[PDB]
Write a protein that binds this ligand. Structure first.
Ligand SMILES: OC[C@H]1O[C@H](O[C@H]2[C@H](O)[C@@H](O)[C@@H](O)O[C@@H]2CO)[C@H](O)[C@@H](O)[C@@H]1O
Ligand SMILES: OC[C@H]1O[C@H](O[C@H]2[C@H](O)[C@@H](O)[C@@H](O)O[C@@H]2CO)[C@H](O)[C@@H](O)[C@@H]1O
Ligand SMILES: OC[C@H]1O[C@H](O[C@H]2[C@H](O)[C@@H](O)[C@@H](O)O[C@@H]2CO)[C@H](O)[C@@H](O)[C@@H]1O
Ligand SMILES: OC[C@H]1O[C@H](O[C@H]2[C@H](O)[C@@H](O)[C@@H](O)O[C@@H]2CO)[C@H](O)[C@@H](O)[C@@H]1O
Lengths: 402, 402, 402, 402
C-alpha cells in the first residue's frame, strides 16, 4: 500500500514489531493515520528491489550497514531533524546514518553480539574459543553441548573470522579502501578453520540456524549461545538462569563483532514523508515509544540519551557495549552488500564441506574484487516476486547501472 | 515460433542479399520450399536476442567471430557435413567455424579489408601510413582528400592498431588467453595515436562513417578508402577507376586486419535443419549458387575450392588474400564481442578528443577484463524492444548466467 | 508481418478447431497452401491488439458482436461473395455480419444458450427460474445441486437479466440508440436480484466458472447447466444422459439470451484474401467442411442452408433455435464490447456482495454512458505484452482516437 | 538533469528568468550548488508529462491553478515552512498553494490582467467594452487601432466572457461543484459574442497573439492592450507614455479576470528537496531575490509582505489589485486543466469562424462534462517528446487512471 494517508512500516521478524505496532496504535489514535507494521522475509533485499520501482513501505527498519547502498540508489529521503532533536541522540549514532553528507535515516539502537551462557550448566564460562572442544566433550557425556549459534548468517561467525585479522575493507585515514579487502587473508583463514574444525570434530552442526540454536539454549540443551539483545526476552520466558558476557578470544585476541545501529529510513517514493517524520521523531524516539518496543524485544543500547541513561545500568547492556568496543561499527558503504553476500556463501560452503576453507575464502575475495552493480544487481534480484512491469524497469535500470 | 517448411535467412545489409534470394528462388522452384531473405539492422545483436527465445531465422549469416558466443548460448545447431563435402572447402575456413571441437557453421567466403585507391587521382598508392599526411596536404589543392574510411566501427581501425603490436588476446599454444589482452600495449597506443594525429592535423574527421566514406570515394572526392570486397560493386556502378591493394605499413610493419570468414549458422530452434543443410550444401555452396551472390556484391575469397580457383585470377582477390595473410583470422571465442565493444568505445572516444589515447585504451582493457556471459548478453539487448513479460524472462535468463 | 501463401486462423478454444484443421488439411492437399489453426487465449482482445499493427491471423473467428468494432478500427476486409453464394446462407445470418452497409464476415453458425439437463436426475426439467430453489433443496439430499453455469462471463447471465426487461441499447426503428441503455432498469434489477438471491441462499456459488460448471455437469454432480452447442461433445464423452431444452421463464417471461453468429472475418492486412475467400467459400461453407468442424464440437444452427436441413432434425438443434427465437440477435456496433465489460463487472460485483444489485447496475450504466473509441481499445490492450516502441505507437494510435 | 547535487528550475518565458538566474548565481556562490534556469515551451503541460516518469526539473514555476492537478498526480513534494517563514507571506497566498490540506508550493506573486493604454493617443480610455468599436473607427482613420491583445490564450479573453455570468465551476459553501460548469451559459455566450463581433467588424484580428499585440502596443500602433505586470518593463523600454487601469465593463458589469498566484513547487522525484527549500525560502523569497527577478520582469503584488509594502505604493500595482478584486482567485482543483483546454478551443474556433459562438461554447461544456483522466491524459500527452520507455510507463499509468 503505497497509499498516501497511511504509513506502512517494515522491520525484521526478530525485533519488537508488536511493540512498534503499539506505537502505531498511539499514532492512529492521536492522528487518525493508520500504521501497518509488517515483518516480511529477507526485507533488506526486497526493499531495494521494490523501492527501485517506487513501491515498498514508507518506513524501513534495518541495521545501518545497508543504508548507504540505499541512499546511493536514490532510495531514501534526506531526513532533516532540527538541532533540538538531533541533540537527543548520541552523536555517534547520527554518524552511522550519514551518507555522502546527508542524514538518511533515524538511528534507533546500538546492537552487538554477546556470549550468553547458562549459569546453572556453566557458572564460569570459557574466556577462549580454544577451550570449547574440551568443554563440549564434557557436556556431551551428559547429553548436552557447549555451544550452538546461528551458523547460517555471517554476522554471527564474523567476530571469530575477524579475531586474528580478517576484515571487510581496509580503514586508513577516514576512508575505506574498497580495493583492499581482507576475507582471504591469514587471519580470516585461521578463524574459519577453527569453526570448521568444531564441526569436523562434532562439536557443532553446519546446519544449525537461528531458531535451532534459540530453542536449544532456551530449553537447557546447550550451555552457550551467541546473540544480540533482541534475544533476551525469549530467554526470560524460558526461566533459564543466564548471563551475558564478553565473546571468547581466539588466538589470544578478542572476537571483534560487527556493530550495527538499528535505523529507520523513509522511502524516497513515499507520499507520506511528513507523517513518517512525525511518527519517528515524536512517537518512536521517545522514552515511551522506545519502551513499548524494548519491552517487546530488547533494542540494545538505544540512540536516545534520556532512555539510554536507564538501560545503561543493565549489566547485559554493559556487556553488549563491552563487546561493541572490541569490534567495529559497520561501514555503510555500498559495497557492504557484496561483502555479506560473499562471506555468507564462504561460511556455508566451508561448514558443509563442499569447499575447503581456502577455496571458500578465495572465491569470497574474488566475488568482492569482481563487484559491480550489473552482475551484483542480478545477484540480489528475486524475479519470483517481480511483475513484468517491475522486471522491465529493472532491465533498463540495469542497462543504466551499467 | 519459426515455421516448418520454409527458410528465413538473415544476412547483413552490405552483402549480396538479392543474389542470395536468387539462390532461394532456384531452391523453391526445385524444392517447393520458399526462402525469405532478410537483412535487418544490427543483426549480430538482434540474433542473440530473438534466438535466445527460440525465434529468429533458420539461417544466420555473419563473420565467424560472433559464432562462438552464439554457440556458447546454445543458439546454433552443430552442422553435419560428410567428408566429401568438407573436402570441397578449405580446411582453414572449417577451423574458423569450429568451436570446442564442434562445427557450428558453414564457411562462405574470407573477408579482409584492403586499401582501395582511385587510379586517376593516385596512380601510385602509398606504401606507408606515414606518408599519408603529406599526400593529403597535396590533394587539398585539388579539392580532394587522401583517405576516408569508416571510423565508427573498430573493425576498420584495428588493422593500424595491430600493426605495431596491439592484439585482442594472446595466442601462445593452441589457446587464447583471455587474461592476457593487448589493446593497451605500446603498439596499440602508437597505432591509435597515429589515427588521432591524422584527425588533429585535419587529414580525417572523427565523424566519418561507412556511408560518408563510401559516398566520398564513389563520387571521386577522396583518393583512398579502406573496405572489403562487398564494396566493389557500388564502386563499379560509379565508374571510378579504382584498384585494390595491400594496406600501407606502419612503423615498417604490415597493417594486420582481423580477418573474417562470412559463415551461415543453423538456428538451434529451427525445425528445418535438413532443409537448411540442403540449401547451404547443394545450392549455395556451388559454383552457380556462389556466383549469384558474388555477382550481387563480391563475397571475397570463397571457401569452396572450385569457385575460388576462378575468383583468385582477379587481382582484387589476390589483394584481399595478401591482406588476409598479413592479418590474423579472428578468434571465435564468446569474448570477441566484448573485445569489439571495448575497442569501439576507445576509438570513438580518442578520435573525438573525449579521452586521450592512453585513457581510452586503458578503459578498453578494463572493460575486457570485466566481461562475463551476463553483461555480454546485456551489451546485446535493448529494452525498447522487450515486452515486460520478456523482460521478466530476461531477468531469469540473466540470473542463470551469473 | 503475416506471410503470403498460407493461412493462419484463430478460433476460440471452446470451438471445433481440430475439425477446422481437418478442413485446412484438405485445403493444403488440394491447394498446396498450408493452413495453421490457432486458438489463443482471450483472442477477441488479442485480435484488435495485433491487427491494429497489421499482424494477427488471415482469418478470425468470433461471434459477430465483436466484428463492428474490428471493422470500425479498419481491421477487416469487406468480403466479396456473389449472389449465388449469398443465396446459400440464411439472410438473417448475413444481416448479423453487415456493418454500415458492408459485409465484414462470413457467417458460420447461430449460437444460442439452452438449458442442458441430466435426464436421470431430473427427467422433467424446470419450466420457471422460480422453482429452482426448491429443486436445489430437494437435490441436496442426493448429494447433488440443481444448477451450475459460468457466472464469470455475463453472456451466461444475460438471458435472465433480459427476461423481465433489461436491454443493452434501445432498438426503436432501424437503429440502436447508444444514449438509451437498459442495464439499470427495473427488469435488469429483478433478473440480477434473483441470481444474487440464488447465491445468498446457497443454491449457487459466486466463484463458479466455465470449467467448474462443465466438470460438475459432466461428472453427474449437478442436474442442469446453461451452455451452447459447443459443449455437447464433452457431455457425450461423459455418457451423462442429457437433454437440451428451452431456458426457464422468469416472472412468466422467456429468458432472452443474446444470440451470436459465429463468423470468420478476413484480416484487412492479410495478403491472402482470395485464398481466405476460397477456403471459407469452397471448403468451410460446404456440407463436408462444416460436418468436419461440427463433428469436433457442435457449431449450432449452421448458416449454410443445405447442412442445416440435416442438423435441424436434431432436437438439440430445435432447442437451440427456440432459445435463439426468444432472445435477440446481438447488435454488432463498436459499443457492444463496452456493454459486455460493464455488465461483466456488475454481475461479478453483485454476485460477490461487493456491491448491491442497484450499485452494480448503475455503475454498468455509467460506464456505457462514458465509452469512446479510445477507452474501448484500452479495455483491449495489456501493457505487459507491449514493447516500449509499441507503447509509443499506441500513445499516437490512442491520440488519433480522441 | 535529474542530477543530485544540482538544481534545475523551469519558469515561463514571460517571467524574469534572467533575474532568477542571478539568484541562482548567488546560491552557487554561497553554496557551490549549480542552478540552471530554463524556460521551455508549454512547460505547464511538459511538467506533468515528465514528472510522471521521475524526470523533469527540481523546481517548477507556474500560476497556482495547475498545482492541484500536480499534487493529485503525486507529482509534488509537501513543503514545510516553519511558522516564522509562513508569517512572512500573506495568508491568502498560502491558501492558493494548499491542496488537500498540504502546502504544495511556495507562493511568489499575485497576478491580474489590467487595461494598459497609450496616454498620448488616448488620455481618457473607455470605461466600457461597448465604446471600443466607435473608438477603433476613430483611430483607424489615423492608421491606428483601439485595442490588441492576445486572443490565443483564454486567460486574456476570460475576463470578458465572465463579465455577464460565465464561470468555470460553481462556488457555493467552500466548494466547487465540478458537475456545475458555466462556459455554455447566457453570460458566456454574451461576452464571447461581443469578442467575435469585434473581429467580424474588423476591430480586432482572430489571429493576434501575445507577441503581435506586445509589438503593436510597444511601437505606438494600437491605443490599448490587455496584460499583466510582467509586460510593463518592455513598455518602459519602448518609452510609450502608458497608464495601467481597470478593465472595461461589459453589459454594465465588471470584467472579472482570473487571478493567478505565481508559485514554485518541488518535483516529488527530486533528489534535491533540501537544496530546493533553501534556495526558495532563503534566496528567492527575500527582498533581494524578489527584487532581482522583479527588476527583470515585474512580478505583480508579491507574496512577501516586507517587499510588498513598497511595491503596493506603485499605482500600477494598485490597478492590478483593483482588477484582481473584481475577478476571482483561480481554483486549483484538478479539473482546471480541462477548463482551460475547452475554453482555448472554443475561443479560437469562435474567433476564426470555424464554429459559431453557440457551437463552440456547447462543445467546451460537453468537453468539461466528459472530463476523466484517461481521455483527458491522452489529450495533454505530447508523444513527439516521449521516449519508448516513457510511453510504456504512460500506457500503464493510463490503464491505471483508469
Ligand atoms: O549475516 C549478514 C547480515 O548481518 C547483519 O544483520 C543482522 C542485523 O543487523 C541484526 O539486527 C540481526 O537481525 O541479525 C542480522 C543477522 O541475521 C547486517 O545488519 C546485515 O546487513 C547482514 O547482511
Ligand atoms: O567493427 C566491429 C565488428 O567487426 C566485424 O564486422 C565486420 C564484418 O565482419 C564484415 O562482414 C563487414 O560487414 O563489416 C563489419 C563491421 O562493420 C566483426 O565481424 C563484428 O563481430 C564486429 O562487431
Ligand atoms: O461474456 C461476454 C461475451 O459474450 C459472448 O461470447 C461468448 C461467445 O459468443 C460464444 O461463442 C462462447 O464462446 O462464449 C462466449 C462467452 O464466454 C460475446 O460474443 C463476447 O463478445 C462477449 O464478450
Ligand atoms: O490561457 C489559459 C492559461 O492561463 C493562465 O496562464 C497565464 C499565467 O497564469 C500568466 O502568468 C501568464 O503566463 O499568462 C498565462 C496565459 O498565457 C493559467 O495560469 C494557465 O494555467 C492557463 O492554462
Amino acid at each position: 500500500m503505497i497509499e498516501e494517508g497511511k504509513l506502512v512500516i517494515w522491520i525484521n521478524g526478530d525485533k519488537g514489531y508488536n511493540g512498534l505496532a503499539e506505537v502505531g496504535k498511539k499514532f492512529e489514535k492521536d492522528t487518525g493515520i493508520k500504521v501497518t507494521v509488517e515483518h516480511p522475509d529477507k526485507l533488506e533485499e526486497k526493499f531495494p528491489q521494490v523501492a527501485a520501482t517506487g513501491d515498498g513501505p514508507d518506513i524501513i527498519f534495518w541495521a545501518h550497514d545497508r543504508f548507504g547502498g540505499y541512499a546511493q540508489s536514490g532510495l531514501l529521503a534526506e531526513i532533516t531533524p532540527d538541532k533540538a532533536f538531533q541533540d537527543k541522540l548520541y552523536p555517534f549514532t547520527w554518524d552511522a546514518v550519514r551518507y555522502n553528507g546527508k542524514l538518511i535515516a533515524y538511528p534507533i539502537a546500538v546492537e552487538a553480539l554477546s556470549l550468553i551462557y547458562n549459569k546453572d550448566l556453566l557458572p564460569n564460562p570459557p574466556k577462549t574459543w580454544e577451550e570449547i572442544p574440551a568443554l563440549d566433550k564434557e557436556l556431551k557425556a551428559k547429553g548436552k553441548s557447549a555451544l550452538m549459534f546461528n551458523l547460517q548468517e555471517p554476522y554471527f561467525t564474523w567476530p571469530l573470522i575477524a579475531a586474528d585479522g580478517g576484515y571487510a575493507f581496509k580503514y586508513e585515514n577516514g576512508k575505506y579502501d574498497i580495493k583492499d579487502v581482507g576475507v582471504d587473508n591469514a587471519g580470516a583463514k585461521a578463524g574459519l578453520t577453527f569453526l570448521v574444525d568444531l564441526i569436523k570434530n562434532k562439536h557443532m552442526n553446519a546446519d544449525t540456524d537461528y531458531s535451532i540454536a534459540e530453542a536449544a539454549f532456551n530449553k537447557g540443551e546447550t550451555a552457550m549461545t551467541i546473540n544480540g539483545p533482541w534475544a533476551w526476552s525469549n530467554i526470560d520466558t524460558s526461566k533459564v538462569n543466564y548471563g551475558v558476557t564478553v565473546l571468547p578470544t581466539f588466538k589470544g585476541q578478542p572476537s571483534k563483532p560487527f556493530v550495527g545501529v538499528l535505523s529507520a529510513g523513509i522511502n524516497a517514493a513515499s507520499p507520506n514523508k511528513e507523517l513518517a517524520k512525525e511518527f519517528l521523531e515524536n512517537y518512536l524516539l521517545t522514552d515511551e515509544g522506545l519502551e513499548a518496543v524494548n519491552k517487546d524485544k530488547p533494542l540494545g543500547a538505544v540512540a536516545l540519551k534520556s532512555y539510554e541513561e536507564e538501560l545503561a545500568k543493565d549489566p547485559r547492556i554493559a556487556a553488549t557495549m563491552e563487546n561493541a568496543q572490541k569490534g567495529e561499527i559497520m561501514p555503510n558503504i555500498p559495497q557492504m552488500s557484496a561483502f555479506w553476500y560473499a562471506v555468507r556463501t564462504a561460511v556455508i560452503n566451508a561448514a558443509s564441506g563442499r569447499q575447503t576453507v581456502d577455496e571458500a575464502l578465495k572465491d569470497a575475495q574474488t566475488h568482492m574484487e569482481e563487484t559491480s552493480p550489473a552482475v551484483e544487481a542480478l545477484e540480489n534480484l528475486d524475479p519470483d516476486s517481480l511483475t513484468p512491469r517491475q522486471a522491465l524497469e529493472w532491465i533498463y535500470r540495469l542497462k543504466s547501472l551499467v
